[PDB]
Amino acid sequence: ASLKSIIRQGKQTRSDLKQLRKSGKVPAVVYGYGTKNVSVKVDEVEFIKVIREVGRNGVIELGVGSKTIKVMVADYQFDPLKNQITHIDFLAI
Amino acid sequence: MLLPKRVKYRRQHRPKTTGRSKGGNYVTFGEFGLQATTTSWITSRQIESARIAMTRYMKRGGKVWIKIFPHTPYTKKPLEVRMGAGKGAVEGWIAVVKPGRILFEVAGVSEEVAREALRLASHKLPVKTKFVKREE
Amino acid sequence: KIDKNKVRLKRHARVRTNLSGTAEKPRLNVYRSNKHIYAQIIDDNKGVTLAQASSKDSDIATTATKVELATKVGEAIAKKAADKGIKEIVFDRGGYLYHGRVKALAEAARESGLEF
């Protein structure tokens, strides 16, 4: 149900995101009306496992601060050359 | 084969080739597609050859889309001429295929039939390609 | 309907680029309605007004209501402006043809001590 997500605080230097994307973690943002801009870290293995069950445009469960606020996926990045996810914009409902 | 009915200027520069594909990376029109992983100039000759191969294999049962087009004309000179005395004369028409771009799309056949068709088409093109399907 | 007052403001904008845009000021801006006529002395370095006079500020005596009322309005504005010490004016006609009522508001203010 609830998924842990460590928050990435401050400026993420390019080598930080580069050597993180070579390890299995993807940045992401969660916002809406009430909660705004918690730049957090999301795992690539569990996210695909939840998207295989709920779908691409469904409601994806995720713990924003160790709590579920029924966040919905708005858009996501993807590079066609490696089959690796890049970023998610997590609109809070 | 393929070329513009009219261009405004008959003699252009050569197009840049370093970089990555800017648009057209996703299988939009059909079900399966062939994706490029190396920069090159794709002439209209090998486009029209790869299309013949891919369609003759499927026995013209499925549908095929060509996601690229030769827009830019390139020029060449006479055999023994020395350097100088103006530009060349138009020779052919090219497309620039950088890594990422989806070249051909196929729809209306099984997975293995399309995989064999897009294998036999990718032996007539000067780039290295891989088989992708519609982004789930 | 061409909305007569809207086609007046285009003409006024075209009037008011060489008039208190690079030229002498204050302006004596007039405004013409179906019945009355209004005028005010304006300066545009700040954007404030210095006088007022109308065809409805108790100037009525039931004369030929359109031209003579313009004359009385002009006399009133000319006696106001010379009070505060303003003997200089550029005349912005507001986009009305300088004829009849606006012409009378103007040429009845020159004779009352306010020299264009």
Add this chain to the structure above:
Amino acid sequence: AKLQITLTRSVIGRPETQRKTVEALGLKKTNSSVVVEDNPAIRGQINKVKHLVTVE
């Protein structure tokens, strides 16, 4: 003062703009050093030639 600056690399093969900044810092020959009060303006000069100079 603070910020002891020492030239470590030569300025042969470096663009002229980098050489001008080293002269402004007061550094002269290789292995020479200077002492300067810390400013936001002196920090910028050291950053431009940070590879050439060593600061303590």
Add this chain to the structure above:
Amino acid sequence: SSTKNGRDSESKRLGAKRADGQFVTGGSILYRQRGTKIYPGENVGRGGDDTLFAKIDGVVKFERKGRDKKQVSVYAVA
């Protein structure tokens, strides 16, 4: 196998001539141009050949006129 091209004009040194916030005298040219890429503000006049010159001496400043348009103005020092 000759060429038919090969003639070009001679480059008119156009563009701005006085930076912003600078002091200028009573006749200095501020901007060369064809047409009006930039309009005259206040204390700035436009020549018959499109060009912007200062009428008085003061600080020069580039403002924005409406949207997608800009102007230049000269203001009195002190």
Add this chain to the structure above:
RNA sequence: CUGGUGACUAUAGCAAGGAGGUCACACCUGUUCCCAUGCCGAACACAGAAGUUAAGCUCCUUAGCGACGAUGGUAGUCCAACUUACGUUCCGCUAGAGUAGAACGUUCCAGG
């Protein structure tokens, strides 16, 4: 809240619905006079029995079209170093989404 006149990057609009009357603004009524139509009192301009909110006009509600618009990410790049396209530091778009948003506003004259 009504009127005149200025400043402002459509957060200032277009479109769709509702309300308002002769104290103001217009429609109107008609060419005696000023003036006018390259034909035509349609406009311009001259004077005004009487009547209407129909349209103009001002105001109220709409997020359909426009305009505005973050954070995160990406592309691109000054610098450096390896060496042939990366790898470290800085700046950092476009597009797209979350959103403001059905304007604020000076000075005068009036019912107040």
Add this chain to the structure above:
RNA sequence: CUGGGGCGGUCGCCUCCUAAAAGGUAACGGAGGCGCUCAAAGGUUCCCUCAGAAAUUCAUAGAGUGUAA
């Protein structure tokens, strides 16, 4: 002048692109034009708003600007 010389083309001026967001910037690099015209196609003052699609409506400008851009 000249990717050796000759034969071919060019030689002065204006406008774009190459040109790397100031200005300048080359090649026998890529495209065009000039060697005038107007007594109103000049000055000043008033008034007016176009192409095109179905006298009316739509229209923001897709017209026109003597002559290339």
Add this chain to the structure above:
RNA sequence: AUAUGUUAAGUGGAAAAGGAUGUGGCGUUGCCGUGACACUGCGCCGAAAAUGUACCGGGGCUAAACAUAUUACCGAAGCUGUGGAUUGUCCUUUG
């Protein structure tokens, strides 16, 4: 030299499309020890020239190779130690 892995071709110490049960890693599924694949690191075939080995400088090495990270040393007319010569500028001492 120290620590942990890679490979076996003498790669290292030239070259492409394309071909392959070579070997290391991570991941992900389908039938209960076997199959499928995804992305990867290092290789191997493709690979034929003229006086003489002859595409490491030589010997020679599968570690004296490659990747990762530390600790020493060698190394220039650079820099510094000592002595001296010329030109300057300061005046701590016209020194």
Add this chain to the structure above:
RNA sequence: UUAUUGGAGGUAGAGCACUGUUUGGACUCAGACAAACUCCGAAUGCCAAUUAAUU
């Protein structure tokens, strides 16, 4: 020379709002190309202040 501030300019990028090239649908929807296309748009370089800290 750096750092603080202001300014002119349209290239890399991207985009289809004009000009041209272009693919597949319905009867306008998706998707692409541009040195001489731009509704947009850097990093830097440039011009200054009569500004400071070094030299």
